[PDB]
Amino acid sequence: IYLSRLLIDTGGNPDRPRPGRKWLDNIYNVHRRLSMAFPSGLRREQDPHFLKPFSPNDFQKTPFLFRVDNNIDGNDKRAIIIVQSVLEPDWDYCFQNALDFLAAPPETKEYNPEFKAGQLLRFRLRVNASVRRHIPEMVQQDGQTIETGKILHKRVSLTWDASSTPDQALADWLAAKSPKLGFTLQRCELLQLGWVYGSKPEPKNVKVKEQGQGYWREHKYNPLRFRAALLEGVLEVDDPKLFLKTLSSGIGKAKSFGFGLLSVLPI
């Protein structure tokens, strides 16, 4: 598989238009752009310069994993995007009209990861602290109303006991499912605990005009909220046929919006 690197300028003059920095405001925009970085054959031949209208059905729907972190390069702040996929990405076709998005040209390296039993890898990982509660619908109404009755099962953020710590709680949450994916954690240090926001358009059929031919479509924007937890540590390995499938896929839900990427450095 391949790992790709994108560098975005975070500092610079703050009184100028910075479309590369503004692109990281919406994570759906990031996912859509990385999807546009995967042309589907005849799209390149029909549109080499990427000027015809964008169509999701004209691009491949292969999954990929990416992580957006931040760093300092000498005396400048930078945002690094690490893209892990299974097919060779084409960053030339994606940003060819948006060369000002990236401060530095993209990079790509072939990854051939395999580790037999006895490797103490150093890992970094940003998970989505999500859980499906059995009773997540109390219907806490607002205003004058405070308590009405309905029940449904929904995904919400992970919660911890008031007498415990978030670090230990997330450590045992990761260790509880850990033998299924094939690793043992020695140290688990919590580095961040926050949210990830985004917006998504959805077509809506307002009334048909004179021969509207399938209603009049109007965009309506719906929000997207995720609870993110970034953590590093040291982990061993066992059953490498399971760890390779763990590396190929992600960990936790919402894998298509920056979560689940496991970064491992051999030691």
Partner: protein, 90 residues
């Protein structure tokens, strides 16, 4: 909605629409006469057709002949614009 919330040339979230053929306006236009664009690219297109003397056939951003001038104007806008002035005027 015909263009999936993407600017045509730079592929960014579109916030405005630019006409191509003007001989349908006043409330009779067709969706094929209009092209979706963002703020930077539409400002570049407006700059590129200020005093060009185009009556009915205006700039088509999907045309691959207008790509270089639009990109150069976009670079000029990125280099020289001041967000403070626009934020102060509105």
């Amino acid at each position: 909605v015909m263009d999936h919330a993407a600017c045509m040339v730079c592929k960014a979230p579109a916030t405005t629409v630019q006409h191509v053929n003007y001989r349908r306006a006043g409330g009779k236009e067709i969706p094929e006469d209009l092209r979706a664009l963002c703020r930077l690219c539409h400002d570049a297109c407006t700059m590129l057709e200020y005093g060009s003397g185009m009556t009915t056939n205006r700039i088509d951003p999907c045309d691959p002949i207008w790509r270089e001038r639009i990109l150069a104007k976009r670079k000029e806008i990125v280099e020289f614009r001041s967000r403070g002035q626009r934020f102060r005027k509105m």
